[PDB]
Structure formats: structure tokens, C-alpha cells
Design an enzyme around this catalytic site. Structure first.
Site, mmCIF file in Angstrom:
data_model
loop_
_atom_site.group_PDB
_atom_site.id
_atom_site.type_symbol
_atom_site.label_atom_id
_atom_site.label_comp_id
_atom_site.label_asym_id
_atom_site.label_seq_id
_atom_site.Cartn_x
_atom_site.Cartn_y
_atom_site.Cartn_z
ATOM 1 N N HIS A 216 0.791 -1.170 0.125
ATOM 2 C CA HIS A 216 -0.089 0.136 -0.151
ATOM 3 C C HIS A 216 0.742 1.318 -0.029
ATOM 4 C CE1 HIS A 216 0.170 1.236 4.133
ATOM 5 N NE2 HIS A 216 0.065 0.143 4.577
ATOM 6 N N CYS A 217 0.407 2.216 -0.488
ATOM 7 C CA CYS A 217 0.862 3.638 -0.353
ATOM 8 C C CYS A 217 -0.314 4.379 0.375
ATOM 9 C CB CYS A 217 1.117 4.302 -1.971
ATOM 10 S SG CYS A 217 -0.317 3.835 -3.182
ATOM 11 N N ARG A 218 -0.965 5.606 -0.263
ATOM 12 C CA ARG A 218 -1.850 6.235 0.542
ATOM 13 C C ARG A 218 -3.180 5.711 0.081
ATOM 14 N NH1 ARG A 218 -2.427 12.696 0.250
ATOM 15 N NH2 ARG A 218 -4.407 12.956 1.570
ATOM 16 N N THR A 224 1.419 1.966 -5.514
ATOM 17 C CA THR A 224 1.091 0.535 -5.178
ATOM 18 C C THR A 224 1.185 -0.082 -6.605
ATOM 19 O OG1 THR A 224 -0.063 0.624 -3.327
ATOM 20 C CG2 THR A 224 -0.646 -1.095 -4.417
#
Length: 282
Positions: A216-218, A224
Site C-alpha cells: 500500500h501507499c496512501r 502501489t
């Protein structure tokens, strides 16, 4: 020609159509809906494909790109942390890759809890974080690694390797070279941990839904998706899988925003070109 502007325009045309088709309707049967008034989606128009959802209260999806199996999710909301940790433990997660930077996590307006660099108790789950290695990825970008030990009465204790790109740039894409290095690190970390489970005779080895890298990223659709695309190109089983296939697969299995920016697609195209991998399906 195969990587020329005409081919790239055709790729973008196909992908744009798909994004539009996959846009969520109100109460879309294709997308996971919140139970009641608790927030599920970190961003209202970045939703979680229902059929591939990992847990009913997370924005997180099983994704298989060619042969490559992962979980892509949003950065968990504070209210989702206990469920997120249970997801991580039940999956026997062989690597958690976090692509949100330290500065983003520190920005309180973004609501990204620092859940893997500190220890804490979240409902019934207690988590301990320990720092391990640091691996340079190129261009001064550094992967900081951790072990996250997840404890809960009635559950087996699970330790999860974490790869955190702590100084991921906040408003630009990382290069294909950095992405390749990151994909290699994430895959290698997962292989080592998966092997440990196999050596112990874990039943998770036989379960298609388990032992998946979690990325995950944000929002779980930009950085991602760039990483997952690079990981699938790093999988020796994926000969002839096209860029069209990989992005289509990510989109149908999570949402139509996967590979959110043209900048991110540019990196995947460059990686594919380096392998002589097709952009388009014939």
C-alpha cells in the site's frame, strides 16, 4: 513501432475506456459498501472490488497479475487498524511494502497512522515493531525494514517483514531503476519468509488466499500499482503477459484507478520495453 507513440496512445485508449467502465455507481454491486456510517474508503471514488475483497471492513483486494499473487490496499484508517492487523496475521504476510513516505505519514491532515514503526495495542491485538535492515534502491531512495510482531489471544503470533520506502518522493514518480530494485527487494523478502512457513509445514502454503505480499501507499492505486506491475515483470512465470493485461487485471480486481497517473504507466512501459514484453494484446 511496438513502443512508439501510436502503440502508447492505443494502450492509453484501451485503459481509459476500462477506467470509465469500472467507475463506481451508487451502491454498485461490483464494489464493497461500508457497513453503516463508519468510513470504509479513504477517498470516496477509490473503491474496493467486492468479489476480490480481503475483509468486509477494509479497502483491500486480492490481485493476481498473470501468476503473481498479491494484496493491494489503501493505507488503513485509524478505525481500521485492528482489522488490518488481523488481515496481516491471517495472511501469514510474507512482506508488507509501505510506499507512503515518512513525511506523508507525519502529516496529520492525511490521517495515516504510524502503525508499523511503533508498538501499540489496537483492540485485542498488540503489536511490536523492531527495526532491521536498510537497503538503498538508487537515487538516494532508501528502504527501511522492520519486523512487526502481531499478538492476540486465541491467535498464533505472526511476525511480518516490512519494507518502508521512507523517503519516497512526495510529488513525483520513482524511476524504473528504483522500481526494479524495490520489486526485487520486496519479492526476495517475501521468498525468505514464505520459505520459513513452508519449512514449518504451515497450512497457509496450500491456500491461494494466503502468503500474499501486501502493498500500500496512501490510496493503493498509484505507487502501489507501479510496484505490483514491476513485481509481475520480475516473475519468471509471466512470459508474454502484456502491459495491457497487467493494468487491466489490476483494474478489474481492485478498481479502475489502478495505475493512477500517466507518469506511473510510463515506468511500466519502460520496464516492459527493456524486457521486449508486449504493450498491447493482438
Amino acid at each position: 513501432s511496438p513502443y512508439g507513440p501510436e502503440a502508447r496512445a492505443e494502450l492509453s485508449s484501451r485503459l481509459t475506456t476500462l477506467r470509465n467502465t469500472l467507475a463506481p455507481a451508487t451502491n454498485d454491486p461490483r464494489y464493497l459498501q461500508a457497513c453503516g456510517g463508519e468510513k470504509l474508503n479513504r477517498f470516496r471514488d477509490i473503491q474496493c472490488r467486492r468479489q476480490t475483497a480481503v475483509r468486509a471492513d477494509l479497502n483491500a483486494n486480492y490481485i493476481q497479475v498473470g501468476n503473481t499473487r498479491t494484496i493491494a490496499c489503501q493505507y488503513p484508517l485509524q478505525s481500521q487498524l485492528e482489522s488490518h492487523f488481523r488481515m496481516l496475521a491471517e495472511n501469514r504476510t510474507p512482506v508488507l511494502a509501505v510506499l507512503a513516505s515518512s513525511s506523508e505519514i507525519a502529516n496529520q491532515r492525511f490521517g495515516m497512522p504510524d502503525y508499523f514503526r511503533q508498538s501499540g495495542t489496537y483492540g485485542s491485538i498488540t503489536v511490536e515493531s523492531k527495526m532491521t535492515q536498510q537497503v538503498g534502491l538508487g537515487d538516494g531512495i532508501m528502504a527501511d525494514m522492520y519486523t512487526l510482531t502481531i499478538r492476540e489471544a486465541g491467535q498464533k503470533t505472526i511476525s511480518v517483514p516490512v519494507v518502508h520506502v521512507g523517503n519516497h518522493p512526495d510529488q513525483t514518480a520513482v524511476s524504473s531503476e528504483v522500481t526494479k530494485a524495490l520489486a526485487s527487494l520486496v519479492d526476495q523478502t517475501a521468498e525468505t519468509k514464505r520459505n520459513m512457513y513452508e519449512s514449518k509445514g504451515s497450512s497457509a502454503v496450500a491456500d491461494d488466499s494466503k502468503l500474499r505480499p501486501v502493498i500500500h501507499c496512501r490510496a493503493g492505486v498509484g505507487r502501489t500499482a507501479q510496484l505490483i506491475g514491476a513485481m509481475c515483470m520480475n516473475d519468471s512465470r509471466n512470459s508474454q503477459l502484456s502491459v495491457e493485461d497487467m493494468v487491466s487485471q489490476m483494474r478489474v480486481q481492485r478498481n479502475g484507478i489502478m495505475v493512477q497517473k500517466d507518469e506511473q504507466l510510463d515506468v511500466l512501459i519502460k520496464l516492459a520495453e527493456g524486457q521486449g514484453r508486449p504493450l498491447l494484446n493482438s
